[PDB]
Design a protein around this ligand. Structure first.
Ligand code: AJU
Ligand code: AJU
Ligand code: AJU
Ligand code: AJU
Lengths: 115, 114, 114, 115
């Protein structure tokens, strides 16, 4: 599991459950190509997006659909989504945990990178 | 204005207005001596807490009553308050303390400029 | 000033100065049309990106080049940039986008006022 | 494990390792009484601070010594520590995870509360 995403809800003090997200990888023509997608579990975590062999060097974008999450809770939020754009594995393979902390008008995204 | 505090509401996307806070300065016996207080304005800011000659070296604590802010909005928050504890004054400096409030989370940042 | 961006450096406790950013507006084909751009001032702020009559309904993206900011400080950051994507203008509103930068983390907040 | 603390370093993109913290509980005389203490592990986590039987209703304060952490990394930070002051278990027992995200001039503290 080289790429994992964890999402927290700062209004409820809970994991953010059933949050959809889409991962893209920049292709040779400099367009965003679909890579993987999934939804957070009851723990707010999404595992299994990719494998060590599949997650090669590249520039990746994770688009977390925070808007649909907030709307399902009855909240009309500011952002369309929470994004993470990063270069991966250019020093060799790493494990990436992306942590997103969500409020209706604010979010933070943090990476924990281990070798 | 050596010390300014700004408070934002991350639920509503607005300044957090009428947020009360007290500032204390740590005394030699390790007790917190009353120093300054006020509440945020319609812009979410609290200005005029102190003056340059009054604000000397020490450990200061800003205790922001975030619980009362959320209670007034009918949201049951996690924190009793937000406490920002820092050593101030290498000589005088200007300090802006920002607090970003959510019911179960808060962030605080300091800008120290000249 | 319908749209203002403020950027802070959480490592140094300072405004983030000379941070470049582009603003795009989503077009009908789902491509990002150039809209506005600039770089932050000595106060970390970027003002004057647009006018009320120009800033109409749409989905807007602010792409802040945080990577170049950290590279200039000799710190290898995580993010290529910070992207703030939001629907703007229920009629005109005033938008302040704040970004708080660390090498491996960023936070962004919006204040929408009248 | 009704109370767990997780600490992340936003400069290095790593768990914040060997961070000391002290937990206090407000006593009947309205003073802060020592409760528990410990240090974060290699994963940035501190477990085992208390037990379901020991962690009764009350007002608790966690003081995380972020200043000594940053100084050991050669950084002179703004805050003396990162604090969390909260009422616990007044609706019945809950499990509390306190997540702290650290930068030299900024920190955020978030609670995940489960039943
Ligand atoms: O348990 C919660 O507090 C919780 C809280 C929030 C949950 C959520 C659960 O989703 C659980 C799975 O729901 C599947 C059926 O719902 C389908 C429609 O989902 C629309 C997006 O919902 C996002 C929030 O989902
Ligand atoms: O402005 C928003 O988008 C917004 C967004 C979300 C707001 C919210 C506002 O709360 C505003 C004050 O609500 C009035 C009192 O409601 C009492 C019940 O509140 C239950 C918890 O609501 C959490 C979300 O509150
Ligand atoms: O202002 C601080 O307290 C502060 C605090 C921390 C600063 C830091 C400043 O970096 C300022 C610019 O550093 C000059 C170039 O150093 C190159 C090597 O940097 C290695 C990574 O340093 C991370 C911490 O950088
Ligand atoms: O592995 C790291 O990146 C790391 C990174 C940071 C580590 C840290 C490890 O501490 C590992 C345990 O060190 C025990 C011996 O050091 C005693 C003095 O510790 C002073 C406080 O250090 C806080 C940072 O500790």
């Amino acid at each position: 599991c080289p790429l994992m995403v964890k999402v927290l809800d700062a209004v409820r003090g809970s994991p953010a459950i059933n949050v959809a997200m889409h991962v893209f990888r920049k292709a040779a023509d400099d367009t965003w190509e679909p890579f993987a997608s999934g939804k957070t579990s009851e723990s707010g975590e999404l595992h299994g997006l990719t494998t060590e062999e599949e997650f090669v060097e590249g520039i990746y974008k994770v688009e977390i659909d925070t808007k649909s999450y907030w709307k399902a809770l009855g909240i009309s939020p500011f952002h369309e989504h929470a994004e993470v754009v990063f270069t991966a594995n250019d020093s060799g393979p790493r494990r990436y945990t992306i942590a997103a902390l969500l409020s209706p008008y604010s979010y933070s995204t943090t990476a924990v990178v281990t070798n």
